[PDB]
Every structure is written in C-alpha cells, then in structure tokens.
Amino acid sequence: NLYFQSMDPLLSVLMWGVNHSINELSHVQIPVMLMPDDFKAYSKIKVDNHLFNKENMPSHFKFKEYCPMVFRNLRERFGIDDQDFQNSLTRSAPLPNDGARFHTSYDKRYIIKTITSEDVAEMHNILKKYHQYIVECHGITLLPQFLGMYRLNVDGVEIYVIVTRNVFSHRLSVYRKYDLKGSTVAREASDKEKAKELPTLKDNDFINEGQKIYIDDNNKKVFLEKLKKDVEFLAQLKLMDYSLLVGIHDVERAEQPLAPGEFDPNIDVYGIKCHENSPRKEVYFMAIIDILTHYDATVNPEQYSKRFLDFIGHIL
Amino acid sequence: NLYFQSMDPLLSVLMWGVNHSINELSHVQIPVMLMPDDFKAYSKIKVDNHLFNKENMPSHFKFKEYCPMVFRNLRERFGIDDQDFQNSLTRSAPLPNDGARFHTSYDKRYIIKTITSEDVAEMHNILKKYHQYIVECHGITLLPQFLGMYRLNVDGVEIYVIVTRNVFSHRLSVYRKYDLKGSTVAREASDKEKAKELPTLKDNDFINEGQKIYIDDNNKKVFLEKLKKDVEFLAQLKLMDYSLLVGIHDVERAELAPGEFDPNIDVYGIKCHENSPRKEVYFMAIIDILTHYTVNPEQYSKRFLDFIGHIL
Ligand SMILES: CS(=O)(=O)Nc1ccc(-c2cncc(/C=C3\SC(=N)NC3=O)c2)cc1
Numbered sequence: 221n222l223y224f225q226s227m228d229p230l231l232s233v234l235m236w237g238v239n240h241s242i243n244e245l246s247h248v249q250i251p252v253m254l255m256p257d258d259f260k261a262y263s264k265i266k267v268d269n270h271l272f273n274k275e276n277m278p279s280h281f282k283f284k285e286y287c288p289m290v291f292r293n294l295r296e297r298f299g300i301d302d303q304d305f306q307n308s309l310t311r312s313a314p315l316p317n318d319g320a321r322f323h324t325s326y327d328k329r330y331i332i333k334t335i336t337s338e339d340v341a342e343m344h345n346i347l348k349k350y351h352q353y354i355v356e357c358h359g360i361t362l363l364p365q366f367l368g369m370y371r372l373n374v375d376g377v378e379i380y381v382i383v384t385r386n387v388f389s390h391r392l393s394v395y396r397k398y399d400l401k402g403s404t405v406a407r408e409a410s411d412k413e414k415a416k417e418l419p420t421l422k423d424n425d426f427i428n429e430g431q432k433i434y435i436d437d438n439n440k441k442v443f444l445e446k447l448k449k450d451v452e453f454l455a456q457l458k459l460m461d462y463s464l465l466v467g468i469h470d471v472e473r474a475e476q477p478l479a480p481g482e483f484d485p486n487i488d489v490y491g492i493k494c495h496e497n498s499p500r501k502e503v504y505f506m507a508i509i510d511i512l513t514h515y516d517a518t519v520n521p522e523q524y525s526k527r528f529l530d531f532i533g534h535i536l
Numbered sequence: 537n538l539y540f541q542s543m544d545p546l547l548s549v550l551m552w553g554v555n556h557s558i559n560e561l562s563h564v565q566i567p568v569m570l571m572p573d574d575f576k577a578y579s580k581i582k583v584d585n586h587l588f589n590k591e592n593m594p595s596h597f598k599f600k601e602y603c604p605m606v607f608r609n610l611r612e613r614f615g616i617d618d619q620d621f622q623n624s625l626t627r628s629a630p631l632p633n634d635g636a637r638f639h640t641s642y643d644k645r646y647i648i649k650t651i652t653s654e655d656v657a658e659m660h661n662i663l664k665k666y667h668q669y670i671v672e673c674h675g676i677t678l679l680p681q682f683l684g685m686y687r688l689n690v691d692g693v694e695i696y697v698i699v700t701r702n703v704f705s706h707r708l709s710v711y712r713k714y715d716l717k718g719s720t721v722a723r724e725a726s727d728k729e730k731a732k733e734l735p736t737l738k739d740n741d742f743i744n745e746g747q748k749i750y751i752d753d754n755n756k757k758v759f760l761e762k763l764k765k766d767v768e769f770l771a772q773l774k775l776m777d778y779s780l781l782v783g784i785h786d787v788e789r790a791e792l793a794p795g796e797f798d799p800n801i802d803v804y805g806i807k808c809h810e811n812s813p814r815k816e817v818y819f820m821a822i823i824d825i826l827t828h829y830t831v832n833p834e835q836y837s838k839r840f841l842d843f844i845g846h847i848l
C-alpha cells in the first residue's frame with residue numbers, strides 16, 4: 221500500500237496527483253483521435269482535508285493537469301503503459317538531482333523538470349505541432365519525450381513541472397556528462413560545478429579535455445540524420461537555446477540477465493554502443509534538451525540551428 | 537471500465553465521490569482505535585474540468601466526505617468490505633425510489649437518503665455515542681447502519697446524503713410495508729400514497745387492516761430486547777419521532793430456496809412462526825432517528841415500545 225509520504229510536500233502532491241490523474245483517465249474512453257479541444261483542456265483539483273490523513277499528506281493543496289488526453293496519447297506513442305508510469309512516479313518518492321531543479325523517478329526511468337509559467341505557455345503553443353511530429357516519426361526522435369505536465373500548489377508555493385523520459389539509462393551509470401550548444405562564448409563549467417563529482421561539462425570542456433565519441437559510421441549517419449530533422453522542426457517553431465545532452469557510461473569502470481554494456485533499446489531509447497575500435501568500452505546517451513525558449517522572448521533560430529548542427533557534426 | 541455516467545449529475549458525483557473516497561482510504565493506514573479528532577474530520581475536493589471528460593461527468597463539482605475514518609470503521613463493524621461497498625455504489629447507477637428522496641444501490645444492498653444540513657449537524661452530535669454503541673453491541677442492532685455521509689455539489693445545487701444498509705432484502709420482494717410510530721394521534725396513508733403499488737402504510741392502516749405478525753417466542757424475545765436497548769439509546773440522546781419500518785415478504789404469493797434468505801446480508805430479516813396461517817418473512821428496523829427534542833423523548837420511547845410489543 222502506498223501513502224505518498226515525503227518530507228517535501230511538493231513531492232507528496234506530485235505523487236498524489238499523478239496517482240489521481242492516471243486513475244481518472246482509466247474512467248475516460250480512449251478516443252479514435254485527438255481533437256483541437258484536447259490541446260486546450262485541463263483538469264484542476266483542489267483538496268482541503270481537515271483532521272484527516274494528516275501525517276501522510278498536506279491538508280490543503282491544488283493539482284492541475286494540462287491536456288490530459290494528449291499526454292496520455294503521447295505516453296502510448298512512446299511505448300509507456302499508464303499503470304507502469306503511475307507506479308514509477310508513486311511507488312517511492314522521486315529523488316532530487318542536487319530554479320532549474322530536476323527529480324528522477326525512483327526507478328530512474330523518468331525525469332521531472334520544474335519549468336516556468338512561460339515554459340508552460342510555450343508548450344501549449346507547440347503541442348499540436350509536436351504531437352503531429354511524434355506521429356510522423358513513430359516516436360523515434362532525439363527530442364525530449366513529453367509524458368505529462370502539471371501545476372502544483374502547496375504551502376504558498378506554486379510550481380509547474382514537466383515529466384520526460386530520462387535521456388540516460390535507467391540502469392547503466394553515467395560517469396561524464398556534457399551539455400553542448402555550439403555557442404562559443406561562456407560555455408565552460410565553473411570551478412564550483414567541476415567540484416561536484418558528476419559535473420555537467422560544456423562545449424569548451426568537451427574540446428579542451430579531448431573528449432571523443434567513438435561510434436561507427438552507420439550509427440553516426442543515422443544519428444546526424446535524426447538530429448537534422450529534429451532541429452529543423454525546432455527552428456521552424458522559432459525555438460532556440462537548446463542543448464545536446466551527452467552522457468557517457470564506462471563499461472569497464474562500472475565493473476569495479478543483461479551482460480556488461482548491454483541495455484534494452486526499448487527502454488534506454490537514446491543509447492548508442494561505441495565502435496569496436498574504441499579505447500574503452502563505452503555506451504553513449506544523447507538527446508536534445510531544454511527546447512522551450514521562443515525567439516522573440518544576437519542569433520536567430522535559423523542561425524542557432526546551423527551553428528548547433530555544425531558543431532555536433534564536427535565533434536562526431 | 538466504469539464511467540460514472542448518469543442523466544442525473546448529482547448521481548454521477550455520488551458515484552465518482554464514493555469511488556474517490558474508498559480509493560483514498562486505501563492510502564490511509566487503519567488505526568488501532570478512533571480518536572476524538574476523527575469525529576470532527578472531513579475530506580473535501582473541488583474539481584474543475586475544462587474540455588475534459590465532458591461526456592461522463594459535470595465539468596464543475598465538489599465532493600465532501602464527513603468523518604471518513606469513522607465511517608470506514610463502521611463499515612468494518614457492520615461486516616461490509618470497502619471494495620464491495622465501492623462496487624455496489626459505482627458499478628451501475630443507484631435507482632430512484634420515486635420530499636424525502638431515496639435511491640437504492642443497483643444490487644439493492646444499500647440505501648442513499650437525502651438529508652438536511654440540520655440532519656448532518658445532528659449526525660455529528662451523536663456520532664461518538666453511536667460508534668461506541670455499535671462497538672458495545674458488536675454491530676447487532678435494529679438502528680440504521682450508517683455507512684457513509686457526504687455533501688455533493690454541482691455548480692448550482694448542493695445536497696447532503698447518508699448511506700445505510702437496506703432494511704429490506706436484497707433479493708426477496710416486499711409486498712406490504714408499514715411505518716409505525718405508536719401514534720396517539722392519527723397516522724394513515726393518504727389516498728394518493730395508497731394508489732401506488734407499494735405504499736407506505738401507517739399505524740391506523742396496520743390496526744384497521746388486521747395486520748398480524750407471527751414470529752416465534754425466541755425470535756420475539758431477541759427482537760424486543762434489542763428494540764428496548766436501541767430505543768433507550770435514542771431516548772438518552774433526546775431523539776424522537778423515529779419509526780419502525782416493517783416490510784413483509786409473502787412466500788407463496790411471490791412464487792436460495794423460497795422463503796430462504798442470508799441473515800448475514802439481510803440482517804433485519806426474521807422468519808415467521810412455522811404455524812403462521814401463511815408463510816411470510818419480516819424485515820423490521822428503526823428509521824428516521826435524526827430529530828432532536830406535548831411529547832418528550834422518554835414518553836415517545838415508552839409509547840413506541842408499548843405499541844411494538846403490543847403488535848408483537
Ligand atoms: C522540458 S525541456 O525539454 O525543455 N528540458 C529538459 C531538460 C533536461 C531533461 C533531462 C533529461 N534526461 C536526463 C536529465 C538529467 C540531467 S541533465 C544534466 N545536465 N545532468 C543530469 O543528470 C535531464 C529533459 C528535458
């Protein structure tokens with residue numbers, strides 16, 4: 221039995237709300253197709269308990285789910301069963317990753333990112349086009365896989381969150397992480413960041429530290445082909461300031477019934493194995509992140525995309 | 537899959553709310569014992585859907601459950617499993633009885649009565665003593681068995697309901713029914729009521745029509761001892777104007793074997809005496825207990841108890 225308990229009341233409201241949201245959708249027929257109204261829909265719940273369940277849950281909170289029918293259909297197109305999703309988000313509390321905060325589900329399958337109200341407005345502005353793009357690629361994309369979007373209110377605090385699939389593996393640990401833009405201005409981790417023992421390194425760190433990505437020509441072509449189409453989609457929406465998140469798993473260093481270095485490509489959908497000539501056995505996890513910044517909110521989206529694709533193409 | 541659809545949006549909210557209430561309590565530990573705060577507690581939820589689930593549910597509604605921990609414990613003490621209760625109130629809509637509105641669950645196990653805010657206030661006034669009484673009698677009582685109490689809202693309408701166990705059988709038909717007070721004044725079904733095909737007859741119809749109830753001595757002793765303890769409980773609470781609801785099933789005018797019933801489901805049933813001129817089953821319980829104090833509560837109770845022993 222689950223109680224949704226947490227020291228962080230926002231996590232309790234999130235778990236309660238995802239549990240509630242998924243159960244509610246079990247009482248709503250699955251439509252033949254989404255319609256325009258589903259992209260402006262929401263469900264809001266306001267809870268006020270008095271002297272009830274008062275050690276597991278906050279007594280007064282609100283939970284709002286945006287476009288529930290759309291995100292349910294996106295989960296299906298991404299191969300995610302609603303009961304599994306519900307269990308991953310509620311069986312045990314999500315864990316913080318240390319404004320641009322994220323949590324990971326306890327089973328490391330999903331990311332919960334705190335976003336702004338402007339980000340929520342931009343997601344609504346692109347949701348029809350994004351959903352149609354996901355339909356056309358059959359869910360195979362390097363874009364983030366958006367699975368749910370909520371507003372939480374508890375204790376005088378109001379936050380928005382979006383749930384995505386983890387770019388990294390739910391099982392294989394990542395020992396080096398980069399956030400790449402192709403901009404060449406202030407793209408280097410701080411000495412504070414580099415003191416954590418999993419820093420997020422940036423463009424000039426990837427160059428200066430001699431980072432290589434050893435993937436064979438077949439996989440590189442497939443990857444860069446996918447990247448081009450995904451970025452061209454973002455540029456058409458006038459989006460910019462997105463990154464390539466690159467995570468590297470070291471097979472021989474995690475050592476000290478899947479065999480070493482193996483991963484389920486239907487769960488870890490962004491993994492690519494290294495080529496046979498790599499100096500260490502590695503697995504790479506690469507995807508586009510932070511896509512919600514609109515142009516008119518210097519380089520324009522067209523120039524940004526060409527600089528991004530050029531840089532990623534040069535580093536392989 | 538259940539959708540809670542109804543032509544009556546208040547029934548959709550009731551079904552939705554009972555579904556919600558029971559599922560929520562599955563995420564709340566069962567306590568070792570109830571505490572005072574549980575008798576003042578409530579859970580409230582307000583739902584505002586926009587362009588979502590608009591074919592099954594009202595877009596705007598609210599659902600409030602009074603003292604959820606208490607009614608959960610009462611359901612357990614009355615032998616009612618929460619999932620069964622949830623299923624009985626939601627798998628198909630409750631049906632109206634066709635003022636003092638009643639609906640019956642689709643499987644005829646439970647009754648949903650509309651009550652006033654004054655009734656809700658009286659229920660809170662007595663709930664502690666009621667629960668303690670149900671503990672002391674191990675759930676064996678002729679009083680209504682209260683299973684849940686809610687407030688329902690749909691955008692311009694607010695109602696209160698209480699859920700009880702059906703006094704009548706969930707399978708066996710009732711061919712005659714009475715509501716008895718021990719009149720001392722005149723209680724008589726109207727000619728309008730008396731044109732329906734199941735009227736609620738009253739004291740003078742029972743007397744005037746020669747109704748006799750034939751139960752054996754042991755069953756009568758058990759019933760009247762229970763009735764005395766229950767009525768003295770009501771009198772102590774200063775309650776009055778309650779009735780004995782009497783339903784009579786006719787065994788070979790209506791047709792588990794005939795005349796045969798489960799006393800663990802139809803907990804108010806009593807078999808007639810084997811020598812009765814015809815085979816009947818009786819369903820008898822005290823109802824309408826929420827009126828707080830010429831007649832005073834002690835006089836009402838003695839007049840009531842004298843009348844019922846009086847007709848057996
Ligand atoms: C809503 S959005 O599309 O606009 N933005 C977005 C940003 C990050 C992720 C994401 C996805 N997968 C894993 C992580 C974990 C990280 S990221 C980092 N620097 N260190 C970590 O551990 C983060 C997904 C979407």
Ligand SMILES: CS(=O)(=O)Nc1ccc(-c2cncc(/C=C3\SC(=N)NC3=O)c2)cc1
Pocket residue numbers: 633638647649651680698700701702703704713715736781823824825826
């Ligand atoms: C909330 S309360 O305790 O104060 N009042 C109360 C009143 C009636 C019932 C009840 C219980 N079981 C069956 C019936 C059906 C009836 S009653 C009638 N006259 N004709 C019918 O079909 C009604 C339970 C409680």
